Amino acid sequence: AEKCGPPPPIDNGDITSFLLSVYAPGSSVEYQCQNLYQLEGNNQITCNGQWSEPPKCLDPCVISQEIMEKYNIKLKWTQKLYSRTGDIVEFVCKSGYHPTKSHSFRAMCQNGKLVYPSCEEK
Amino acid sequence: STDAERLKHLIVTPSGAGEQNMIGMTPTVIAVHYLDETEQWEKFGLEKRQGALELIKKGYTQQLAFRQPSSAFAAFVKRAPSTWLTAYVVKVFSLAVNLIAIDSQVLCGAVKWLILEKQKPDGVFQEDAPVIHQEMIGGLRNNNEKDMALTAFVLISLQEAKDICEEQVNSLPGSITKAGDFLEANYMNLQRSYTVAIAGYALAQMGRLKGPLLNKFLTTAKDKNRWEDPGKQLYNVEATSYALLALLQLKDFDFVPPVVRWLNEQRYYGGGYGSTQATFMVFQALAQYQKDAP
Amino acid sequence: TDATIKKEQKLIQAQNLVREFEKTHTVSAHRKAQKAVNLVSFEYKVKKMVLQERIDNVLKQGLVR
């Protein structure tokens, strides 16, 4: 009723306290995302019976060696592998393979996507 | 069932820092666990059970002195928190909830820490502060396939504390799923029988050790009774115990008798330098065999 | 209110298993009662201490088989 129910469960994250069975009116709850996950919204959503809009964990990017070796590319600073939402990743070609100009070798990480440039041999 | 006359030495007094104390709890906790689930207390001496329970109490409250405010655990309070030590403490305490009283918030705070802080985007769990005693971590000391084996270890500890931390941690199912996704993705590329066994147990708990992945697990066994790699035999005993627990989850009881026969024929009764993971897993697997015996 | 429903189902299952332990001083009822009491929420703090005191009292009396 005038109090509150359970806090809304977000993806790739959770609240920062012990989950109460019944929540008081007007109480706000802090949210936290997993590692490298970028939060987008108010971490403290307040409590009528309907909760405030919970924040969203923006996904990060995983640059695995498999995708790079299939594209014949390396990193400029070869190896963090993990990148946050917005971190620019600078790729380079491998020995013998030259750039194909398919994409600029400076790739941004938006949510989950990240476009990989390619390199080809003579 | 292994005669309890040999296991008298596993009753010890937990004494040490954030790591030695768990090396002290491990034999006492797993011995009481074994004798309870095998129903050998009457012949071994039931009067000793209460005293052994008091020893487990000591280790529990002593370990609480090393619980960092981040709900994590390390050898000292001002030291960096270890992912493996937190997962192991969760595992030992999750078995100990059947023996002594345990605060649920301690285990669940440690689980929330492992999920939010020490799980990478692809579901891998990362050890950012390795323990001082690399002999208490068993076959996981080997560097090859450290990602797969550590993720499986933390995943097994999370699924053990599932009963206690389901209500308070909503990120637990998603974290378990992400870890199993990583294991399933890189399972067929494994070459180390220890990793095949521990990841097989983790996936079998999730009901994912099926199809070709399942085939790899069963075909890794030499002579269809043991999971071994070139190295110390304590690692091979730990791996075969993980494999026995995976088999017991898979209900493949036509494969179990040779494995239990090999485990009994090793005559391993616990103890030895860095015998923590070996003693814990061998007696966990044997106890779960006697409980799930066909 | 499935949250509070389970919060109370844990309590009643702990009550029945602690009573079964008090009536049957065995290892099996000890493990079941201890696991059930530990799973009770932080809400019923004093009630958990009562049931844990009862488990300890039964253990002081002793158990058989």
Coordinates of all heavy atoms in Angstrom, one line a residue, chain A residues 6-10 12-15 17 19 23 31, chain B residues 111-112 115 165-175, chain C residues 6:
Chain A
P6 N 9.3 -5.3 -3.0 CA 10.7 -5.6 -3.2 C 11.3 -4.6 -4.2 O 10.6 -4.1 -5.0 CB 10.7 -7.0 -3.7 CG 9.3 -7.1 -4.4 CD 8.4 -6.4 -3.5
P7 N 12.6 -4.4 -4.1 CA 13.2 -3.5 -5.1 C 13.3 -4.2 -6.4 O 13.4 -5.4 -6.5 CB 14.6 -3.2 -4.5 CG 14.9 -4.4 -3.6 CD 13.5 -4.8 -3.0
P8 N 13.2 -3.4 -7.5 CA 13.2 -4.0 -8.8 C 14.5 -4.6 -9.1 O 15.6 -4.0 -8.9 CB 12.9 -2.8 -9.8 CG 13.2 -1.6 -9.0 CD 12.9 -2.0 -7.6
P9 N 14.6 -5.8 -9.7 CA 15.9 -6.5 -10.0 C 16.4 -6.0 -11.4 O 15.8 -6.2 -12.4 CB 15.5 -7.9 -10.0 CG 14.1 -8.0 -10.4 CD 13.4 -6.7 -10.0
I10 N 17.6 -5.4 -11.4 CA 18.2 -4.9 -12.6 C 19.1 -6.1 -13.1 O 19.4 -7.0 -12.4 CB 19.0 -3.6 -12.4 CG1 20.3 -3.9 -11.6 CG2 18.1 -2.6 -11.7 CD1 21.2 -2.7 -11.5
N12 N 22.6 -7.6 -14.6 CA 24.0 -7.4 -14.4 C 24.3 -6.5 -13.2 O 25.3 -5.8 -13.1 CB 24.7 -6.9 -15.6 CG 24.6 -7.9 -16.8 OD1 24.1 -7.5 -17.8 ND2 25.2 -9.1 -16.6
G13 N 23.4 -6.5 -12.2 CA 23.6 -5.7 -11.0 C 22.7 -6.1 -9.9 O 21.8 -7.0 -10.1
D14 N 22.8 -5.4 -8.8 CA 22.0 -5.7 -7.6 C 22.0 -4.6 -6.6 O 22.9 -3.6 -6.8 CB 22.4 -7.0 -6.9 CG 21.3 -7.6 -6.0 OD1 20.2 -7.0 -6.0 OD2 21.5 -8.7 -5.4
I15 N 21.2 -4.6 -5.6 CA 21.2 -3.6 -4.6 C 22.5 -3.7 -3.7 O 23.2 -4.7 -3.8 CB 19.9 -3.6 -3.7 CG1 20.0 -4.9 -2.8 CG2 18.7 -3.7 -4.6 CD1 18.7 -5.0 -2.0
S17 N 22.5 -3.7 -0.3 CA 22.2 -4.0 1.1 C 21.5 -5.3 1.2 O 21.1 -5.9 0.2 CB 21.3 -2.9 1.7 OG 20.0 -2.9 1.2
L19 N 18.4 -7.7 1.5 CA 17.1 -7.5 1.0 C 16.1 -7.7 2.1 O 16.0 -8.7 2.7 CB 16.9 -8.5 -0.2 CG 15.5 -8.4 -0.9 CD1 15.8 -8.5 -2.4 CD2 14.5 -9.4 -0.5
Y23 N 9.5 -3.2 2.7 CA 10.2 -1.9 2.7 C 9.3 -0.8 3.1 O 8.1 -0.7 2.8 CB 10.8 -1.7 1.2 CG 12.1 -2.3 1.0 CD1 12.2 -3.7 0.6 CD2 13.3 -1.6 1.2 CE1 13.4 -4.3 0.4 CE2 14.5 -2.2 1.0 CZ 14.6 -3.6 0.6 OH 15.8 -4.2 0.4
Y31 N 21.9 1.1 -6.0 CA 22.2 0.0 -6.9 C 23.6 0.0 -7.4 O 24.3 1.1 -7.4 CB 21.3 0.1 -8.1 CG 19.9 -0.5 -7.9 CD1 18.9 0.2 -7.4 CD2 19.6 -1.8 -8.3 CE1 17.6 -0.3 -7.2 CE2 18.4 -2.4 -8.1 CZ 17.4 -1.6 -7.5 OH 16.1 -2.2 -7.3
Chain B
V111 N 29.0 -13.5 -1.2 CA 28.6 -13.8 -2.6 C 28.3 -12.6 -3.4 O 28.7 -12.5 -4.5 CB 27.3 -14.7 -2.5 CG1 26.6 -14.9 -3.8 CG2 27.7 -16.1 -1.9
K112 N 27.6 -11.6 -2.8 CA 27.4 -10.3 -3.5 C 28.7 -9.7 -3.9 O 28.8 -9.1 -5.0 CB 26.6 -9.4 -2.6 CG 25.2 -9.9 -2.3 CD 24.4 -8.9 -1.5 CE 24.2 -7.6 -2.2 NZ 23.3 -6.7 -1.5
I115 N 30.2 -11.6 -6.9 CA 29.4 -11.3 -8.1 C 29.7 -9.9 -8.7 O 30.0 -9.8 -9.9 CB 27.9 -11.5 -7.8 CG1 27.6 -13.0 -7.5 CG2 27.1 -11.1 -9.0 CD1 26.2 -13.2 -7.1
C165 N 21.6 -18.2 0.3 CA 21.6 -16.9 -0.3 C 20.7 -16.6 -1.4 O 20.9 -15.6 -2.1 CB 23.1 -16.5 -0.7 SG 24.2 -16.3 0.8
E166 N 19.7 -17.5 -1.6 CA 18.8 -17.3 -2.7 C 17.9 -16.0 -2.5 O 17.6 -15.2 -3.4 CB 17.9 -18.5 -2.9 CG 18.3 -19.4 -4.1 CD 17.3 -20.5 -4.4 OE1 16.4 -20.7 -3.6 OE2 17.5 -21.1 -5.5
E167 N 17.4 -15.9 -1.2 CA 16.5 -14.8 -0.9 C 17.1 -13.4 -0.9 O 16.4 -12.4 -1.2 CB 15.8 -15.1 0.4 CG 15.4 -16.5 0.6 CD 13.9 -16.7 0.2 OE1 13.0 -16.1 0.9 OE2 13.6 -17.5 -0.7
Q168 N 18.4 -13.3 -0.6 CA 19.0 -12.0 -0.3 C 19.9 -11.5 -1.5 O 20.2 -10.3 -1.6 CB 19.9 -12.1 0.9 CG 19.2 -12.8 2.1 CD 20.1 -13.0 3.3 OE1 19.7 -12.6 4.4 NE2 21.3 -13.5 3.1
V169 N 20.2 -12.4 -2.4 CA 21.1 -12.0 -3.6 C 20.3 -12.4 -4.8 O 20.2 -13.6 -5.2 CB 22.4 -12.8 -3.6 CG1 23.4 -12.1 -4.6 CG2 23.0 -12.7 -2.2
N170 N 19.8 -11.3 -5.5 CA 19.1 -11.6 -6.8 C 20.0 -11.7 -8.0 O 19.6 -12.3 -9.0 CB 18.1 -10.4 -7.1 CG 17.0 -10.3 -6.0 OD1 17.0 -9.2 -5.3 ND2 16.2 -11.3 -5.8
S171 N 21.2 -11.2 -7.9 CA 22.2 -11.3 -8.9 C 22.9 -12.7 -8.9 O 23.7 -13.0 -9.8 CB 23.3 -10.3 -8.8 OG 23.9 -10.3 -7.5
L172 N 22.5 -13.6 -8.0 CA 23.1 -14.9 -8.0 C 22.8 -15.8 -9.2 O 23.7 -16.3 -9.9 CB 22.7 -15.7 -6.7 CG 23.5 -17.0 -6.4 CD1 25.0 -16.8 -6.5 CD2 23.1 -17.5 -5.0
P173 N 21.5 -15.9 -9.6 CA 21.2 -16.7 -10.8 C 21.9 -16.2 -12.1 O 22.5 -17.0 -12.9 CB 19.7 -16.6 -11.0 CG 19.2 -16.4 -9.6 CD 20.2 -15.5 -9.0
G174 N 21.9 -14.9 -12.3 CA 22.6 -14.4 -13.5 C 24.1 -14.6 -13.5 O 24.7 -14.9 -14.5
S175 N 24.7 -14.4 -12.3 CA 26.1 -14.7 -12.2 C 26.5 -16.2 -12.5 O 27.4 -16.5 -13.1 CB 26.6 -14.3 -10.8 OG 28.0 -14.6 -10.7
Chain C
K6 N 7.6 -16.9 1.8 CA 8.7 -17.7 2.0 C 9.4 -17.4 3.3 O 10.0 -18.3 3.9 CB 9.7 -17.6 0.8 CG 9.1 -18.0 -0.5 CD 10.1 -17.8 -1.7 CE 10.5 -16.4 -1.8 NZ 11.6 -16.2 -2.8

